Design a protein around this ligand. Sequence first.
Ligand SMILES: NC(=O)c1ccc[n+]([C@@H]2O[C@H](COP(=O)([O-])OP(=O)(O)OC[C@H]3O[C@@H](n4cnc5c(N)ncnc54)[C@H](O)[C@@H]3O)[C@@H](O)[C@H]2O)c1
Ligand SMILES: NC(=O)c1ccc[n+]([C@@H]2O[C@H](COP(=O)([O-])OP(=O)(O)OC[C@H]3O[C@@H](n4cnc5c(N)ncnc54)[C@H](O)[C@@H]3O)[C@@H](O)[C@H]2O)c1
Ligand SMILES: OC[C@H]1O[C@@](CO)(O[C@H]2O[C@H](CO)[C@@H](O)[C@H](O)[C@H]2O)[C@@H](O)[C@@H]1O
Ligand code: NI
Lengths: 311, 310
Amino acid sequence: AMNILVTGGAGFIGSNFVHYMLQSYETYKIINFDALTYSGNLNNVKSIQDHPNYYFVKGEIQNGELLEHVIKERDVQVIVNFAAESIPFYDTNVIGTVTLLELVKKYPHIKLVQVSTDEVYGSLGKTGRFTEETPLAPNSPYSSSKASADMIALAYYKTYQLPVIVTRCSNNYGPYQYPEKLIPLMVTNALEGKKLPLYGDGLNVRDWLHVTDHCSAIDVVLHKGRVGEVYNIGGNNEKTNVEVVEQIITLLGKTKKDIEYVTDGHDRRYAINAEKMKNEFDWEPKYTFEQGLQETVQWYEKNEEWWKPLK
Amino acid sequence: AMNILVTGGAGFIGSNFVHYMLQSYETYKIINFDALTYSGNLNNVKSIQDHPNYYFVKGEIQNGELLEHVIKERDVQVIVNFAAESIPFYDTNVIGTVTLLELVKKYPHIKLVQVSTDEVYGSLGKTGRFTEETPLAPNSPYSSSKASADMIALAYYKTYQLPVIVTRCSNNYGPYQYPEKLIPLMVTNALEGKKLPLYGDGLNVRDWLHVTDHCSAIDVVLHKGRVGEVYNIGGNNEKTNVEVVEQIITLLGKTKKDIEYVTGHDRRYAINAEKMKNEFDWEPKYTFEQGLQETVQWYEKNEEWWKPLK
Ligand SMILES: NC(=O)c1ccc[n+]([C@@H]2O[C@H](COP(=O)([O-])OP(=O)(O)OC[C@H]3O[C@@H](n4cnc5c(N)ncnc54)[C@H](O)[C@@H]3O)[C@@H](O)[C@H]2O)c1
Ligand SMILES: NC(=O)c1ccc[n+]([C@@H]2O[C@H](COP(=O)([O-])OP(=O)(O)OC[C@H]3O[C@@H](n4cnc5c(N)ncnc54)[C@H](O)[C@@H]3O)[C@@H](O)[C@H]2O)c1
Ligand SMILES: OC[C@H]1O[C@@](CO)(O[C@H]2O[C@H](CO)[C@@H](O)[C@H](O)[C@H]2O)[C@@H](O)[C@@H]1O
Ligand code: NI
């Protein structure tokens, strides 16, 4: 029944989302629109590349002509914007978003889900959790670029009533995450017999959300989410980086002697309260961290062909 | 002693600032860097265009190569960024700011004062005033572009300790404001024997700051302002649009019979500037009654300036 444009769909979360939608909705058309930057990888999507309902488009979200063309042609009804970079950093994160908003402004029947991050709220103290009313206070170029796109997106809603929704999630983990990222780094280093580094003092705290739970959250927001709102999405947990490493160590029968301390800045604590998702759609994460972590570790053990070339 | 780059210096506030600094500091060099868009007007600065300490540069703040060149060459020490637009809207307001931050990152001795607006906080209810801890909640494309540049600017401070300061002020009024803007529109229409329009129901509330008080605030921040901080700047008043028109009407001996109703905009803006007060003992020197009167006179005396723009 629906046609969905997934920008950044060759990336980590994006690819996972593309798979999730195709498996969950046998009649939806999924258009993966991706610029294939360093973090974009077509291998993430090679299993469904010949699926009759999948379409790939190589391009930048800043390319309005191409976007219009794809939109008219595929009769697009929803746009989920995962496309982002981690100077043309702002071009993609801010200006790319603006380009999408202008398209929606011209085709106001098209719903836009701007996928954002909890880093937008800055760091928490020892206690407390972010809510959708927590004020924005980004500390990095990346998080500031992300917050900027959010505020701009919501201003388009308040100014022209465009069907725009913003989601803010905690740290994702799962299959297809590049090996530079914490969990894969720890796992793949362990598999390669290397030291497991901990930046800082290892006590930074994060809320770990399994990628597919993020995908199911977006699926809900996309379908039943109220236009103009923000929705925090989290894994209902909170872990120090060192706890995460210790769990990975145990899962691979390694010892703590493999850990090593290094220096770096990074925010001290992130933790998301997702009661709004819960109250409004009765949504909760399906995975516990213990369960997610284990499957993820296995995935990396079983997929050296995928991560070796990226390391 | 100092060399200051004023971006957007051919505009309303920018030009006023250029004049204010040249008159206040006989040994400072002021470099007006402006792209001369629709709202840029070299007549705003023609009286000081031959001043030995003034320099003009035509260019966009997105032009990093040009900026670097000007910086190296004029041995710039401070940058005050007034440049802004009211799609390449974001290019100038966000990306232009990023371009300036990158340059500061490369020349971290250069202080940057990012000039922002109270529209960044969104609208207030019936009571209360904005503080520097009021959360951001912009409602328009313009205010969202402005807030974006602020958050980005402060993130550069938190991430690399760059000497960046953000100021947020209320509605400016005064000499060299285009005749499309409320006060000039009312005044210039009255002078031309036209109806004085009130958009909406005339009850939108604003805090009116005289442009030279804004300039003096920036002068203080520039010199004594703490890096990484935000400073709210306001006129310590609050007026409905209709009150403003009534005052203009009495100042020109017109009657209310000249007002006319027409028809989105935020409901109420009001700034609390106690931080400026506590930290630098700064207050606006103008009262609205005083500022409004001088402004009205200015428009009466400068038809040569506003006629071509109307
Ligand atoms: N830990 C996390 O991964 C996390 C946390 C919170 C929020 N999210 C957010 O979700 C989104 C997806 O994150 P991710 O981890 O999949 O990152 P990723 O780096 O894997 O995804 C980026 C994808 O977008 C593509 N891309 C980059 N610039 C583009 C452009 N201008 N036009 C079109 N495509 C472009 C890349 O080629 C790649 O395919 C981001 O907006 C991110 O901020 C992620
Ligand atoms: N009531 C107000 O006017 C008010 C209130 C609060 C904050 N401010 C802020 O103060 C600043 C100046 O306001 P104003 O009303 O005096 O401005 P204005 O529109 O009169 O002046 C804008 C100036 O900037 C220049 N400019 C535009 N794009 C440029 C670019 N890419 N590169 C270089 N220069 C460029 C224009 O040529 C023009 O001379 C803005 O940043 C605005 O956001 C204004
Ligand atoms: O390296 C150029 C650099 O400057 C900018 C500023 O707008 O553009 C300049 O250079 C353009 C092409 O190189 C010219 O079209 C233009 O004259 C000039 O503004 C940036 O866009 C770019 O990063
Ligand atoms: Ni086509």
